[PDB]
From a paper:
Here we aim to understand the molecular basis of a selective bitopic molecule that distinguishes between two closely related aminergic GPCRs, the human dopamine D2 receptor (D2R) and dopamine D3 receptor (D3R). These receptors share 78% sequence identity at the transmembrane segment and 100% identity at the OBS, making their pharmacological distinction a notoriously hard challenge. D2R and D3R differ in brain distribution and signaling properties and are both targeted by current antipsychotics and drugs for the treatment of neurological diseases (such as Parkinson’s disease). In this work, we determine the cryo-electron microscopy (cryo-EM) structure of the human D3R bound to a bitopic and full agonist (FOB02-04A) and coupled to a GαOβγ heterotrimer.
Positioning the ligand binding pocket at the center of the cryo-EM box improved the resolution at the D3R extracellular region, and allowed to classify two cryo-EM models containing two FOB02-04A conformations – Conformation A (to a global resolution of 3.05 Å) and B (global resolution of 3.09 Å), which mainly differed in the position of the bitopic SP and residues around the SBP. In the alternative binding mode, termed Conformation B, the 1H-indole-2-carboxamide SP of FOB02-04A is seen to interact with a less hydrophobic pocket defined by the polar side chains S18241.51, Y3657.35, as well as V360ECL3 and P3627.32 residues, termed hereafter SBPECL2-ECL3. Notably, π-π stacking interactions between the 1H-indole part of FOB02-04A and Y3657.35 stabilize Conformation B. Subsequent frequency analyses showed that Conformation A, that engages SBP2-ECL1-1, is predominant with an estimated 90% prevalence, in contrast to the 10% observed for Conformation B, targeting SBPECL2-ECL3 region. This information triggered a targeted search for Conformation B within the cryo-EM dataset, which resulted in a model at 3.09 Å resolution. In this model, cryo-EM density supports the second conformation for the FOB02-04A SP so as to make π-π stacking interactions with Y3657.35 in a similar manner as found in docking and MD simulations. Interestingly, in this cryo-EM map, the extracellular residues of TM1, including H291.32, are not resolved, reminiscent of the pramipexole, rotigotine and PD128907 bound D3R structures. This suggests that binding of the SP to the SBP2-ECL1-1 stabilizes the TM1 conformation described above (in agreement with our MD simulations). In order to understand the role of Conformation B on the function of FOB02-04A, we performed BRET assays on the Y3657.35A variant, which exclusively affects Conformation B, resulting in wild-type pharmacological properties.
Author numbering:
A (entry chain B): 4 to 340
B (entry chain E): 2 to 120, 136 to 247
C (entry chain R): 32 to 223, 323 to 400
D (entry chain C): 7 to 63
E (entry chain A): 4 to 54, 182 to 234, 242 to 354
Amino acid sequence: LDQLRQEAEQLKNQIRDARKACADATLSQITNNIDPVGRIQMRTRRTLRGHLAKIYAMHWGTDSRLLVSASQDGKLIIWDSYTTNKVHAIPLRSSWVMTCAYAPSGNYVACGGLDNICSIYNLKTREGNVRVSRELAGHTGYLSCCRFLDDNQIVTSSGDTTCALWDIETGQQTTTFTGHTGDVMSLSLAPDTRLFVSGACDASAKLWDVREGMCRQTFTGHESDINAICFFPNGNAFATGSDDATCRLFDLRADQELMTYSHDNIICGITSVSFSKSGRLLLAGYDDFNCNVWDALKADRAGVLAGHDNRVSCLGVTDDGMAVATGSWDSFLKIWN
Amino acid sequence: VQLVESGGGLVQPGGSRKLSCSASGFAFSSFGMHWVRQAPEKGLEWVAYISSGSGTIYYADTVKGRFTISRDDPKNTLFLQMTSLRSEDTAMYYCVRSIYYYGSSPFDFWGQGTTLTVSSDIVMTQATSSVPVTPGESVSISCRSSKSLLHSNGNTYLYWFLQRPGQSPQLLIYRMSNLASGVPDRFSGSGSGTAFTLTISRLEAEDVGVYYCMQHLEYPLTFGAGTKLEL
Amino acid sequence: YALSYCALILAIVFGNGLVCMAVLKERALQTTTNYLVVSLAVADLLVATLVMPWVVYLEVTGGVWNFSRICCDVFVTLDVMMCTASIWNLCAISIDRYTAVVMPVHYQHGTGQSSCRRVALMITAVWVLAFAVSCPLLFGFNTTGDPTVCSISNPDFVIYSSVVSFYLPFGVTVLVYARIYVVLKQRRRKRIREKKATQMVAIVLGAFIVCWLPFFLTHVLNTHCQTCHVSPELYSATTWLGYVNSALNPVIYTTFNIEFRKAFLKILSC
Amino acid sequence: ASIAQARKLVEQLKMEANIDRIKVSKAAADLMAYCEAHAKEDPLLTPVPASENPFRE
Amino acid sequence: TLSAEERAALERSKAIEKNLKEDGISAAKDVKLLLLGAGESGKNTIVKQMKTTGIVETHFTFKNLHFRLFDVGAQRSERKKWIHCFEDVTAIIFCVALSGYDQVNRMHASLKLFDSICNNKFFIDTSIILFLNKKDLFGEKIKKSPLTICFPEYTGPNTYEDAAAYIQAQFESKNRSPNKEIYCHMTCSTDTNNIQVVFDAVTDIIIANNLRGCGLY
Ligand SMILES: C[C@H]1CO[C@@H](c2ccc(N)nc2)CN1C[C@H]1C[C@@H]1CCNC(=O)c1cc2ccccc2[nH]1
């Protein structure tokens, strides 16, 4: 309705005025007095070889040693990052995986893609071989991201413009999250795991309540589709990555854009973004074959992680924040520290 | 998941034998397999080991050359060709599974074993023997090593096994701390370098048995004397 | 014109040494097809470093060998080895391109087990045939007059060396590239950039014949004829043609490849 | 869903608008306070000594 | 150096590496084709000739070549977000319904799709095996209704051969790259010979890729 559209615009204007009223200063302005972090030189400590196709997703285990990586050759390889040893090599039924998740307990590993099925794999089996514990079907679009709340329930975001909370035991969607106009491309679980945020192709990120089972806030500002999203370690803010070559920090409480991380020399799109343990550093993977380390409070490009021959598709930071691993389309998964 | 060993009976000292173990219910091809023998009125003793794919084979110094271990991946069968026999070779030969990756628990499942009768190294010791304990109170079992098991990586390769009377040994604790799957939370192992302690919070009826502390720092693998718990 | 040969020694080492480092730095150019070009660049660098300084010394001294006879024997052997290796590697590349066109499914995209086992076999075959041809000269088979001169003047050896070192591999190369042109024409006719393919095969064969044939033709008519006007300055001119071939070999084989072009522009950007 | 989706999105925006929001100054101060407080045990900020670096030669 | 368990774990890693390499060598020889039509373009007919949701894998062997045909017909979302999955596809098999020139415009939508796919930044060095299906129906459709209805300024006689040749010429347009080659072929109902022209197209594309890698193209 035209009246309801004018009401929606009036609410947006009221909202922007409410932010501007509470925006007495900016993040750049307030953090002008703090000492800027000195230039960071991170060396490639280890290179993980074995993949024979473009790596699309990787996720660190909670022990900060084991990590799983998904590639287009239809293989999930679980690496011992410390020794570069292969703990597992799981053949995939559909060799079109675009996301992979490692359970917080370290018992299960989930993957999916164009098959529209979030295949879950049990590692701790008595037979001693990794087998498909459950195949979660119901999404009508390509699966983009999946994240484990615990060993029982998993939240997944698909290309049908819908995020879905599943129960792995029963094997259907416990709760369905709808509202996105474009395809949802990313997920991020808050430290408390009470709320999660998802960025979609409609150039907007929406905050969702897991228990309630519907959206809470919607954050706009991006000029193009969002590819990645990640919460701030404290769990009150989150950063996003899009194709317009800009990272954008948003605050759950303020309900607005706080800072922009855009350099004029960068025009290529952003694939994946991640924070440090303290949250002072923001690491974003770009299509120019190198990841850039941004100061979360200065927006100054602190360092550049270069060495990959193709697009850096994914990167992950360990729970103890000891190292950073970046996976690229050159079938290599390098670890930086 | 089960292992069924075959071959045994009465054997002449000059004769030869071939013990075959049939593995079923699990992916035998990816599991390295050990042979552990137990002489009557004597603790466990490591005999031989063959890895997944038959790539690496190790033997104990007492059975080097005499015995020949082999595996058949297609039919999931493990063989132990005993060429020369002696009077001290009599024992209950157990076939044990062993999977080796980061976070794995080797020696988790043991076979039933077959009674065969015939007509330098890390000196793992306990110095405990029989320990009479009543059910209900806590239990402390001490094992000691002549060499420090705390390797530079940062884990101590110690393994506690529970052998209930008239039953195969069962893995309790692996790497001194981690409890095996199915083992209640009562059992808890501790130690530092050389001296190690296995502690049970409460003792029940099924806890009665013999406890063996095996090191896994380097082959040959050496078992303890065997601490017996009873009423 | 000893200074002219010194200019080449800089020309070759610049060209192939830039080609050699380019392949190792970029993983995109680590193809089994390109390993033949790397092998050719290695052979070309060995010519520039291990052989050419002897020719410069012999041009500045005024045609005299003041060193020991074994030094002349090892120089002659090394020169014949390095050159034979160059010609038969050009022949090995032509055979590789023939396999790529005629047998494309077993060739893959310059990778696989069948492509690697063929390239490695061919690279071995050229480097052992070069040794086989050059072996006798080191075993006191090069008959000469006074020890003051150092040259290959054994007609029984020279005729068979020239036959099995240049004329055979040249005849194989020309036949192979002639078969590549006709099969590409036949395939394009069966359908119903060939202009590039024709230009590349024409310039490679044209560069090879122009910069090697004159020497071996003068060497064979000198070694076997009743009377021939084989002037020494002509022998030096043919030697120079034989070595400017090696100098031109990397340029013609790499700089005309789009991947190598991008690579060289990236390397020289600094 | 035309009118049905129009009632869905206005109810969504009405509920979105009915929330209590904190000052950007207070928010940025909390973000700064967390950054500096937990900065000590952040191996990415400062190169950690090799002695306590698991990823090494 | 390494303990008994660390050595056994390394041996397991080496065994996995060997298995991965063997599986890689086995899968490297397979030819990968992306079937990409527009609704009733004759995707179901051609895939039936060669041989719930998600893409449909159709693998068939023909003359010592194992072709893998990917039929994306479930993902109704924006293409660009999953087009980058098929970087190393050998060829793109595009189907077009010739009979659907006037009835709906459907042909315009097919031209717009082909324009988008052919000029995609991911599909630059990838040849297109274009199939102009349902030419038998077009045979009588052209004799009833003129082609000018769909495409204006045709300025030609309304017969079978020339009309199909003009559509082919327009489809051969919107190709701004010199490395691409469109192997246009007109098929009707059932021929039992489309697998042969696909094989003939693929082996030509492989030869072209080999010569490009060598440096003759
Ligand atoms: C250029 C390579 C090309 O490759 C070599 C080759 C390879 C294979 C093969 N079968 N036969 C020959 C043949 N070299 C020819 C080159 C070594 C000789 C020149 C030696 N400088 C002299 O001291 C000298 C002065 C002088 C004056 C007059 C006449 C002769 C003279 N010579």
